[PDB]
Every structure is written in structure tokens, then in C-alpha cells.
């Protein structure tokens, strides 16, 4: 038995200089502590280079991270779409808590059967969701707009409200959702935005905002990473 | 399969904080040591060491958490930075510049030169008799690479030193007394460690040390 929950995040790839990397956002593994209250641990996107039996058996939960880089239908990471889309259907098969987040959340939904839209700002009938370019993480990341809970699933019944801001740093989105997917949240465009896999064994979320930013002064933010740290408690006994 | 956290660095890339950890160690760690690696956040006081010590099976270091490793029973192995950082971890100094010395040798890769050339091995390197790298059967002269600026000057009490360069220079070291094994090394051994007997009886016996706390 540990002394706190083993919380994987998910490493994306990464050449610096003469060396491929792999590598995870400090905000994430901080709010993993913070937020969850658990231990982060990066796994790497080695993808059948590790057991993934044995990866998943190390764990009490995963964080799928988001990142610059894009799933395979210009920046991807063909690295960590070969370790991740696995995974999360591994990982909630094992009742294994899963938290997505933004590319995360996009993955889950890929991995089962869904479709993204490229560019949602070209799509013709959803706002651009992407960041401000050129200004500072703060900016960045502060709300930017809203999010519409649709009732009787996950979201609710964390308690969050019926509506209520968040932050938007995405050029991709859903466009298909994939079977077995519950729809938890829409953006006030009609952009799915967050989602729950209906009869997991083990809490199985994904949104396509960033909750981990400053998530404790947050309390949709918090309530997401608490109810996620509880999951892999639970699971560690 | 045993655990087997390889710390990672912090780096700024763009706008954001990330923690970094190289795929070659990563792959030696899977294919010499037979282990499952993940990556240690550089978060320091954020973390509880002693969770994180708990989680593990071994520790690799690269670039106190190495001394509650080792005073934990916790298999270390160092290479390159995390040779050095053993070294002053027990209280050894080191050279910033090892070739501005004057009596040793230049021991930095050349430059502007791929990572094939960069990494192949450049100088000799001698087993002292009696220690851990004789005792993993390690022959008493083998090549190793060299891609290091600094190197080891003061010996910290309480290491013992494994092998030196042909100028003299401490390459190795291990923890005398230690419960596990807790072996630094200056040259890169990760480096496709299937190809080099020497690197990967490294590798494998760190990866056997870890396999028996996982026990
Ligand atoms: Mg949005
Ligand atoms: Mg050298």
C-alpha cells in the first residue's frame, strides 16, 4: 500500500536540440497535487514499447493531458496517439479513473469512434475557440466562455452549476460524438465540450477546457481534480 | 516488471514550464534494465519524497532525493549530472571545467557532430579491483563515451571509487555500505546499451537490483 494515489500523466514527445525528450506541463503535475491530491508520475509515450498490463496495474489513475499537438485524423504527436488511444480505452476497461483534458478529452473521444472537427473556427457556425495569440499564460487562460452542464451525469453529480465560465485554448473540437458517450457539457455554440463514458466501472471524464489552471481559486476547476482524486483513492484500495 | 522513476528536468518551451526526460534513457531503462520507467517530476518540496520513494523500485539520475534513496535501500544508478550531483550529495566537489584542468584530458563530445559520433566511445576507462563494477564482471579496461565539461575533483567521504579515465580522472563511484546498489557514472552507458557488453551489464544489474525491491 502507498502513501498517496499514483496519478499517471501522460508525456507528449518533444526533440530539443540534439535529443528527443518527452515531456508534461508543470501546471498539470502541480494541480495533480494540489487539485487531487495525489502523486504525479509521468508515463511515457513509448507506446508498445511498454507493457501497457503493466503500466495500467502501476497506477490509480490517469490524466490525459492536453497539448499543442493534434490527434491524427500541421502539429502531431504520432508518439503519443500510439500510447494514449490504447490506453484510455485500456485504462477505463480496467476501472482505472481517467481524467481528459483538452487533446486528452479529444482522445477519448477518437478512441471510441467519434470524429473532431480540424479547425472549429472554420467550421462556419461555432465560435473561435482558440486563445488570444501573443499575450501571457493569464490572459491565456482566464475564462473566456461559458458552459452549459447538461443534467443527470458526472458533472452534476459533482455539483457543479448549470452554467458557468471556462477557458478556451483550442483549435480542435468534436464533431461526431462517439457511441457510448455521454454528453456532459456544451459550449453555448453547441460544442461538446465535455463528455463521460456511460457504464464505466471507474469515473471516466473528459473536458475540453483546462481545469488544472490555477485550479484551487477555481471551483468548477477544483470540484473536477477533487472528485477525480477521490476516483483513484478509491481505487488504490 | 519493477518501477523505475527517471528524474526529469525542468525546461521553458514557449510560454510554458515543462518537465523533460530523455527517450534514450527511457529505452535502456525498458531494454537494459528490464523495467517499467516513469518519469520523477522536478518538483522538489511540492512533492512528498518519502510517497515518492515508496512508489519506486529504483531511481534513475541523470541532470536530497538521491541520499534518501540510497539511506532507503532504494537501487540508484547515476550517469553524467547524476554521477556528479552523488557525488556532491555526500559532500565532494567538483570541476566546472575539466579541460581547463591542466592534467586532464578534454572530456566534451565534439561538437556540431551527430549523436552517433558524439556518443561513441572516445577514451578508456579502468576498473578499480574490489568494487561494484569489478563485481558485476566488468573487464579491468573497457571504452566508454565521454560527454562531459565537468567531473569529479573532491571524492565526498564515504564513496568508493570504481574506475578512472587515463588522465586520472574519477568516472565512477559507488556508496560504500549501501543496503542496494548505488553505482554513479560519468559516461553515458544508456547509450545503445544492447550494442555495448559493458554498458548493458550496467544496466541489467541495476535492473536485477530493482526486480528484488519489487520482490
Ligand atoms: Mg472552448
Ligand atoms: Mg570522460
Redesign the pocket.
Known amino acids: 500500500m502507498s502513501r498517496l494515489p499514483l496519478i499517471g500523466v501522460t508525456a507528449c514527445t518533444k526533440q530539443i536540440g540534439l535529443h528527443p525528450y518527452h515531456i508534461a506541463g508543470d501546471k498539470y503535475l502541480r494541480a495533480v497535487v494540489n487539485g487531487a491530491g495525489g502523486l504525479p508520475l509521468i508515463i511515457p509515450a513509448l507506446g508498445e514499447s511498454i507493457d501497457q498490463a503493466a503500466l495500467l496495474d502501476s497506477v490509480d489513475g490517469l490524466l490525459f493531458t492536453g497539448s499543442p499537438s493534434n490527434v491524427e485524423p500541421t502539429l502531431h504527436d504520432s508518439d503519443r496517439d500510439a500510447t494514449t488511444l490504447p490506453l484510455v480505452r485500456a485504462a477505463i476497461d480496467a476501472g482505472i479513473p481517467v481524467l481528459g483534458i483538452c487533446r486528452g478529452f479529444q482522445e477519448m473521444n477518437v478512441a471510441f469512434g467519434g470524429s473532431l472537427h480540424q479547425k472549429?473556427h472554420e467550421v462556419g457556425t461555432f465560435?473561435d475557440?482558440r486563445e488570444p495569440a501573443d499575450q501571457p499564460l493569464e490572459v491565456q487562460y482566464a475564462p473566456?466562455?461559458a458552459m452549459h452542464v447538461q443534467p443527470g451525469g458526472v458533472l452534476a453529480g459533482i455539483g457543479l452549476p448549470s452554467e458557468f465560465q471556462?477557458?478556451?485554448?483550442?483549435g480542435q473540437?468534436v464533431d461526431r460524438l462517439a457511441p457510448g458517450l455521454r454528453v456532459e457539457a456544451l459550449?453555448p455554440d453547441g460544442?461538446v465540450?465535455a463528455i463521460s463514458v456511460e457504464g464505466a466501472k471507474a469515473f471516466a471524464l473528459g473536458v475540453?477546457?483546462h481545469p488544472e489552471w490555477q485550479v484551487l481559486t477555481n471551483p468548477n476547476y477544483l470540484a473536477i481534480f477533487q472528485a477525480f482524486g477521490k476516483a483513484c483513492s478509491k481505487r488504490a484500495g
Not at 166 to 170: D, G, P, R, T
Request: aromatic share 6%.
Open positions: 472549429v465560435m475557440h473566456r466562455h471556462v477557458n478556451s485554448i483550442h473540437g459550449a460544442l465540450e475540453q477546457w
